Ligand binder design. Structure first.
Ligand code: DC2
Ligand code: DC2
Ligand code: CL
Ligand code: CL
Ligand code: CL
Ligand code: CL
Ligand code: ZN
Ligand code: ZN
Lengths: 306, 306
């Protein structure tokens, strides 16, 4: 029988310069009304305080690559990276990751400089999460709302939502870092209201019929064309730029070198590039990500089994 | 009689995270060919080295607000801001500002997160500079190429181009910081080639007939709606966002508060907002800039007077 989700968090500011998250967090800390539902209330949290204030992605280490049980379970020192110190505080608050104490759910807000529009990033295929995406699609006709599935290859998970029993990132782009677009703030806000609505109904005992949907499963990344120096030698090609989620046949151009030469996609088959030309992924050696567009079957989530 | 411009510089990377400049600079340092013209060669320079590498705007102080004669003429200490140390090195190289030693001309490259497209920022109305903009307009039909006139209210000038006898910024947006768009890199590159072409002809003794053009003269800025805390209380309104250089009548909306309320433009007459929602201007308390669209007469620049 269905367990209601009662300890629910919404984290903004995991990256200090992704502004929808940041300003929603700050706002709700002052104005928690809109996070109240009948069966539960979602705790608003500003994930990376120091970064949010310096308005940069991270101080010492990406907070969202810092929540492995190794990191979390390690022994303090003087000069642990700030984000490691902070990760542990989030473990204290939302976890401990892996224990029965952890939150029921974390909704983690993000912005991107890629043209992804609305995208939910999920680290497993737990049906709850696909039912959720699907609820969002139904509530917003004609607005795309896509699911990026990024399972961990290893066993170690790294992200802030990985701390709670379940979780998911709401990613929205394009937006420059340090820039708050009114249209995106308000659309994030609405989608968050809707995600909370969803959880209300789930808790209320709502039947969620099995269904089918297309999703986007990570195949791994592609780095920028580089000089032996490890420097850029070109950038995302004009015909790829801004076309996240659209199909990339082999033989099509993906980069343009400074020397004027087109670079071409070499691969077995058609893929779906996602997070094309994200500011933050330059250092992570990632010009974009390769996904396969599959169609999965999502089991029903019922109050009672039949 | 006309003096040729012979010591000419192109600075990129004044802000470490504005990428067209940065990658053009790095490129030319390796590939100086395309900066050679018959009568002169332009020296490529990476303006802010430390910032360019940390990929941020500035380390201690905006390099482009750090070239006043006070700063330049001040006495070293241990803990002068890095950009002040660096400003002085640029004075050594391109100046000294105000002396007969200084460069003939500095072309200073910039990117913006506002939707300005191609914009030349000039700190005086020296006809050379308007003749230049005008040359750019003629060479690129249908592509807007606008002149933002930002005279110094005081006497003290602050920018990197202010060091050379004359100079001008080439600004192009929109682009997120830390993101290099291929279309913008290459269009900057072409426009730079063209600016050098211009100087070639000027040096060759070319007659530049008097003419008339519209320009955009600064009237000052408008800050974001703020909480008494000095925090944001809203952002650029959806109908203003992305509409740089287009007219703002009074009574039209300029902000949208988080509380849902439209803020309205209050002023004497129609203005032309420029650099709407630039990441970097959040701390400088500037949501956008007000300009008046005037039509000036530009004197001829002839080889011989008639
Ligand atoms: C560019 C950016 O800050 N977007 C987030 C997305 S969430 C993560 Cl669970 C998987 Cl990639 C990230 O890159 O960390
Ligand atoms: C946002 C940005 O980095 N653009 C430059 C423009 S040039 C300056 Cl001469 C007058 Cl505003 C600046 O703001 O410094
Ligand atoms: Cl993109
Ligand atoms: Cl559903
Ligand atoms: Cl804008
Ligand atoms: Cl002309
Ligand atoms: Zn993020
Ligand atoms: Zn700049």
């Amino acid at each position: 029988s269905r367990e209601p989700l009662l300890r629910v968090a919404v984290t903004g500011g995991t990256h200090g310069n992704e502004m929808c998250g940041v300003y929603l967090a700050r706002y709700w800390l002052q104005n928690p009304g809109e996070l109240q539902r009948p069966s539960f209330s979602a705790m608003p949290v500003l994930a990376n305080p120091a970064a949010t204030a310096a308005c940069c992605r991270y101080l010492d280490r990406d907070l969202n690559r810092s929540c492995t049980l190794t990191f979390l379970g390690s022994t303090a020192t003087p000069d642990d990276p700030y984000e490691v110190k902070r990760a542990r505080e989030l473990n204290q608050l939302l976890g401990p990751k892996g224990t029965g104490q952890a939150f029921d759910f974390t909704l983690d807000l993000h912005n991107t400089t890629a043209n992804t529009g609305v995208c939910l990033i999920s680290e497993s295929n737990i049906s709850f999460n696909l039912h959720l995406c699907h609820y969002l699609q139904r509530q917003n006709p004609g607005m795309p709302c896509r699911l990026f599935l990024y399972e961990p290859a290893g066993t170690e998970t790294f992200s802030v939502e990985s701390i709670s029993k379940n979780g998911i990132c709401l990613a929205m782009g394009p937006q420059p870092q340090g820039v708050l677009r009114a249209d995106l703030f308000s659309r994030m806000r609405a989608l968050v209201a809707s995600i909370l609505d969803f959880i209300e109904l789930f808790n209320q005992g709502m039947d969620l019929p099995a269904f089918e949907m297309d999703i986007y499963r990570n195949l791994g990344s592609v780095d920028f064309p580089r000089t032996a120096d490890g420097d850029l030698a070109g950038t995302v090609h004009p015909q790829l730029q801004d076309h996240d989620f659209e199909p990339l046949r082999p033989g099509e151009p993906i980069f343009k070198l400074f020397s004027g030469e087109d670079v071409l996609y070499e691969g077995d088959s058609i893929v779906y590039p996602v997070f094309i030309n994200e500011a933050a992924y330059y250092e992570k050696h990632v010009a974009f990500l390769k996904s396969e567009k599959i169609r999965v079957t999502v089991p029903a989530l019922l109050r009672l089994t039949p």
